[PDB]
Each structure stands twice: as structure tokens, then as C-alpha cells.
Structure 1
Amino acid sequence: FYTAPSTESKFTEVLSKAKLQYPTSTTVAFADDLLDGYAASYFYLTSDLYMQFQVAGSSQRSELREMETSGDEAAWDCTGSTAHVASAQIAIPVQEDGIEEVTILQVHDSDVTPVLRISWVSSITIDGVTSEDVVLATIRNGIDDSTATKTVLQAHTTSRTEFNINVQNSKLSITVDGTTELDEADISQFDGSTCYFKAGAFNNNPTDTSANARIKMYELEWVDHH
């Protein structure tokens, strides 16, 4: 009985440029499936026109993965001269008890490393400073370095928030409601990698593997320029 996100033309283009993964990395719905009215408990359109992702379990996901309209997977040069831009209007609800971190946007390499995760976190400690209930940027220091650089972007609000990721020429910037919160972070450690965007709900390290992470997107698009 779930309404499909494809019924809203504001999502037609990104869905044509996406495939849906759930509850792990396996695709459950390709672009043509998504455009043909795909809907389920973990991926549906709310009555007020949010595309809502929901998932439970450790490291489980309901996530769109960037695709080309050709059906090729997106695999752009992570540090190339072409600008790649993802924009999303996201409402992060108060998360259920036991939900501790939810990744909502990513730049992922074509193998096994997230270049960037934007995530909500219950708590984070960065160089001795503890922040509670914030939205975080995490940039991995390398493919062979499991550590990452972390930057608080925003105090969590239930309000619809505009996020923009701009990647170009080995730098990455993030704006939140129009304000730069990460200014040209270096990602040269992904020279020679290819990359793609992801958006949705990716549940990291829950303390209740039964609780549902839930994320709502009012707008979502990804583009490039030359």
C-alpha cells in the first residue's frame, strides 16, 4: 500500500540516475524498476512528498547509488577536473532508541572505501571535544588508512536542511543551508580512484539491531559540469 517516489516528477531524474540497494549492497531495484513505481516499507513516498528510507540492523542500508542514464554505473575520476555535485533537502527525524549513527550521503570509491560520509551521530569526540546530536562529515585518510578526518557540520534539527557536496580537482566542499561547513578538503588520497554518490539511510553501529533508522529527502539530485 506504499506510494512510489516515482509519482513525484521532482524525483524522476535522480531515479533514472540511480539504483536502490537494500538491505546490503545488492541492488533490489534498478532505474527502470524505480521509475515504474517501486515502493516498499524501506523506500516510499510520504503523504507530504518526502522520499523516505528506513532500515534496521547493523550496517544495513536503504540507499540510492548513482548511475548513468546509459545503465553504466557512475565511475567518475574522484580528483578530476569535472565538477561533480550532489544536492539534497533532507529531514532527519529524531532517531529511534538504539540508533547511533545514520549515514545519509556518501561519495564512495568504486571499490571498498567511502571517500566521504555525511552522517547523523548521537555522540562524537573530535580532538578532545564532544558533540552530541550533530551531523558530521567523515573523510577517509586513504584506502590503506582506516582512520578518517571528522568535521561537525550542523546541530541536528528535524527541519528540512539543504546539503550540497561539490567535488572537483582533488578538493571536496560541503555547504549546509547555503553556508560552507567544509571548505575544499583535500581528497588527493583518491587520485587514481573512481567515485560515485550515494544517498539514503545507512545504519552504522546501532546498539539495538531491531531499531529502524529513518531518513527523509524532499529533493535529491546529482550532476556534473565541464
Structure 2
Amino acid sequence: YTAPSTESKFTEVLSKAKLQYPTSTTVAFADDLLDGYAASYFYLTSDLYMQFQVAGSSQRSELREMETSGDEAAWDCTGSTAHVASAQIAIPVQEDGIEEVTILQVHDSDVTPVLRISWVSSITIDGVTSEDVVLATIRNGIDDSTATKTVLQAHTTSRTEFNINVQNSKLSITVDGTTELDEADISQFDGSTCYFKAGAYNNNPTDTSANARIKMYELEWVDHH
């Protein structure tokens, strides 16, 4: 397998990441990734996509945001400093039995995802069913398992620009340059710290042997002061 590190467009984000697979345990740290880490679940395609692939319920092949110092990313979820994740993602047609795949997250430093962006085979929101869409899920609180869900985009196989902007207790998502979630409130994470994630996180498959698969042509995360 060809390593994503062979493409300079990924050098910086890999320097600022560690790879988790198939669960929360890190399999490759930044220096491992930069030294050519590659596997069936994480490799560079011939047309220069970083592809994540994983099977199993709640299993993942996922990059977790890091500082170049080796510190885990842990920024104030609702602080004044803006944190931005940008990715160009091609979501292929998912294999039979794959029902939801999380491709980007804002996660707190414990057990709660602030935001998941995920492809879903179907979803029903306030009595409206949507099929084959890309979704934003924002948990209502650490002690509230419920979430506010928002359809962002009809699923396409085409390469799509996703931007997550977090600042001052609000979170915004743009898709191909169009705001699809405008300053959603995340004050329920006051006092939490946060980090970005990107990859393939397989949610509630009906075939635990099927492979979820997500491709990224560009990926970066930054802050601005």
C-alpha cells in the first residue's frame, strides 16, 4: 500500500494527527504516519485520495487532531480562538449493510462528540424522512444522549468541500462553500476541551463484516488568533 505521507498535501495534517484503528487505541502516531504508515485501512489511492476503510460496529479508521509538540489537541470548545477543519471528501456508495459513516467530528476530551458529520442511508427528523444524505449531529449535552440533527447535503460521489468553524460557543458548517449549519449553539460544552477527527467511523451497520470506506483529497485543521 502507498502511504498518504508520500503526498506533501498531507504532510502537515499527518504531523498534527495520530491514527486510531480499529477502536480508540492509536495504531500510528505522527512520526509513524510521516514515515510512510500504510495499511488496508489507511492508504493513498492511485488518484491521490487518503482512503479510510473499516468494518465492524462502532469501529473506526480515524485521524485524531494532535499538536506538533506531541500534546493531544485540547482546545477550549467554546473559546474565543476560532478552530477550523477543512476537508475535500469523496463519499463512495457504501457497501451493502453500511448504514451510517461518520467522516468528521468535533469531539470533547472525554466521551462525547460535539459534532458528527456522517453519511446516513436514511434519517427521520421532525417527521421528515431523508434518504442517502449527509448529516450534522450535535449532542445536546454531556448528560443528554439526544442530539440536534440537520441534513447538510444530498449524498453525491463527487468530491465535496466540508468546512467546520468553531468559535465563541457557536459552530458553523459549510458544504461546497454554502453555509448549511449557521452558528449552531454548543454552549452545552462550556468547560470542555475539544479536538477534530476525520476518517471513517462505522455507526450501527446491519452487516458487521461490511467495509465502510471514505476518501479524502485534502484535509487540514488550524486555529486563528
TM range (shorter): over 0.9
Offset, 1:90: 0.0
Offset, 1:124: 0.1
1:139-181 deviation line (CA, Å, top 9, x unaligned)? 0000000000000000000000000000000000000000000
Partners of 1:64 and 1:210 in 2: CA distance: 22
Partners of 1:164 and 1:81 in 2: CA distance: 18
Offset, 1:74: 0.1
- What root-mean-square deviation, in Å, do the aligned CA atoms of Structure 1 and Structure 2 show? 0.1
Offset, 1:66: 0.0
Partners of 2:93 and 2:129 in 1: CA distance: 19
Offset, 1:102: 0.0
Offset, 1:55: 0.1
Partners of 1:84 and 1:198 in 2: CA distance: 13
Partners of 2:48 and 2:177 in 1: CA distance: 23
Q: Matched residue of 1:28: which SS?
A: strand
How high is the sequence identity, in percent, across the aligned residues? 100
Partners of 2:203 and 2:51 in 1: CA distance: 18
Q: Matched residue of 1:125: which SS?
A: strand
Offset, 1:184: 0.1
Partners of 1:188 and 1:202 in 2: CA distance: 25
Q: Matched residue of 1:131: which SS?
A: strand
1:175-223 deviation line (CA, Å, top 9, x unaligned)? 0000000000000000000000000000000000000000000000000
- Counterparts of residues 21-170 of structure 1 (less than 5 Å): 21-170=20-169
Partners of 2:194 and 2:203 in 1: CA distance: 21
Offset, 1:77: 0.1
Q: Matched residue of 1:141: which SS?
A: strand
1:73-102 deviation line (CA, Å, top 9, x unaligned)? 000000000000000000000000000000
Q: TM-score, normalized by length of structure 1?
A: 1.00
Partners of 1:104 and 1:3 in 2: CA distance: 21
Partners of 2:224 and 2:99 in 1: CA distance: 36
1:96-143 deviation line (CA, Å, top 9, x unaligned)? 000000000000000000000000000000000000000000000000
Offset, 1:9: 0.1
1:23-45 deviation line (CA, Å, top 9, x unaligned)? 00000000000000000000000
For structure 1, which runs of at least 5 residues remain unmatched after alignment? none
Partners of 1:104 and 1:60 in 2: CA distance: 13
Runs of 4+ in 1 over 2 A off after TM superposition: none
Partners of 2:103 and 2:215 in 1: CA distance: 9
Aligned to 2:197: 198
Offset, 1:17: 0.0
Partners of 2:60 and 2:147 in 1: CA distance: 21
Offset, 1:57: 0.3
Partners of 2:94 and 2:205 in 1: CA distance: 11
Count of residues in correspondence between the two structures: 225
